[PDB]
Amino acid sequence: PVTLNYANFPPASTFPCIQMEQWAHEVRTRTRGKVDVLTYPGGTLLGARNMLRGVMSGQADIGCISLAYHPGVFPVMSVFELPLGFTSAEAASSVLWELYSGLRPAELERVKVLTMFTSAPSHFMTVTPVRSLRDLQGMEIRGAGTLSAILEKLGATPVSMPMPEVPEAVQKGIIKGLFTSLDVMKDMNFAEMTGHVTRADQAVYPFAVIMNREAWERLSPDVQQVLDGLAAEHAAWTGRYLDAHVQDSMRWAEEKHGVQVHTLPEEDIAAMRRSVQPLFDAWAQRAADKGADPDAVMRTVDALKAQY
Numbered sequence: 001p002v003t004l005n006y007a008n009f010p011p012a013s014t015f016p017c018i019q020m021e022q023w024a025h026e027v028r029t030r031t032r033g034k035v036d037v038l039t040y041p042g043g044t045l046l047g048a049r050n051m052l053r054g055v056m057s058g059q060a061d062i063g064c065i066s067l068a069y070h071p072g073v074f075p076v077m078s079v080f081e082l083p084l085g086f087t088s089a090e091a092a093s094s095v096l097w098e099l100y101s102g103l104r105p106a107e108l109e110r111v112k113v114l115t116m117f118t119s120a121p122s123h124f125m126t127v128t129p130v131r132s133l134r135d136l137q138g139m140e141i142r143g144a145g146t147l148s149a150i151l152e153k154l155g156a157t158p159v160s161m162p163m164p165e166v167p168e169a170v171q172k173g174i175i176k177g178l179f180t181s182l183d184v185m186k187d188m189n190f191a192e193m194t195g196h197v198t199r200a201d202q203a204v205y206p207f208a209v210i211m212n213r214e215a216w217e218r219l220s221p222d223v224q225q226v227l228d229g230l231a232a233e234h235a236a237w238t239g240r241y242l243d244a245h246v247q248d249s250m251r252w253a254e255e256k257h258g259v260q261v262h263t264l265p266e267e268d269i270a271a272m273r274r275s276v277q278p279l280f281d282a283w284a285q286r287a288a289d290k291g292a293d294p295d296a297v298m299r300t301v302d303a304l305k306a307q308y
């Protein structure tokens with residue numbers, strides 16, 4: 001029997017940790033006890049920033065990274081931080097894993113990628129109501145990576161930070177809100193901090209579950225095929241869990257904490273779409289600057305969405 005240490009950064013209650021536990025359960029079951037997983041939620045082994053380097057140095061065997069936390073590092077897979085039209089985490093997660101699987105971009109060659117998944121679409125959670133784009137102007141809102149770039153295009157003031165730092169930043173007035181999926185209203189108790197939600201139907205945050213190359217290579221071919229054979233099913237499972245849980249989270253937030261929900265006017269939604277359009281070109285240019293083929297990437301994103 002081998003035991004793999006799986007690091008994660010956010011609290012045990014949140015979806016990246018929930019999925020980690022489910023994955024560990026399946027690994028134990030499907031390897032008939034040959035592989036065990038010892039999990040470290042809440043950043044006790046590796047945190048959000050040192051996750052990638054700590055898995056690569058072998059301080060942990062496995063880890064969970066939010067790609068948006070690593071600017072410049074993932075020129076190809078960062079396409080999934082653009083608004084690609086997904087309305088559910090289940091579809092986005094499945095297409096993300098298929099894109100990685102089909103392109104295997106060099107940016108991730110130095111780790112083994114065990115599976116991938118995404119958050120649900122991003123919305124605004126704020127301390128004061130946002131009923132129009134006018135209300136967002138100059139407002140300090142948390143994002144990361146290209147999600148922060150989206151905020152800047154919309155006229156907000158992005159402040160980038162990893163999820164575990166967000167509650168204090170809101171509590172202490174460093175930011176006025178955050179831009180991400182609504183599961184955190186419950187799972188991190190933002191319902192008691194940000195009493196206003198504005199629909200945005202925006203981009204998702206992509207994640208990878210990564211494994212130290214040497215740890216992976218120390219696994220037998222039969223155990224490898226088991227972990228590989230879990231990857232696609234688990235991507236979908238994670239998105240599916242999250243989709244349902246987002247609805248539960250908002251129900252609890254509205255009913256038990258009086259959260260107010262707002263929608264933007266149609267004209268603001270159209271203007272919002274136009275203002276973020278140039279980020280696609282900027283993504284493509286960075287990708288090409290790094291030797292990748294963004295036309296091919298977008299052709300594959302389009303095909304995989306159509307297949308779905």
Ligand SMILES: O=C(O)C(=O)Cc1c[nH]c2ccccc12
Pocket residue numbers: 010014015016066068119120144162163179180181183184205
């Ligand atoms: O990766 C991020 O920081 C996100 O905003 C995506 C996300 C949505 N819900 C979460 C719960 C815990 C950690 C990250 C996220």
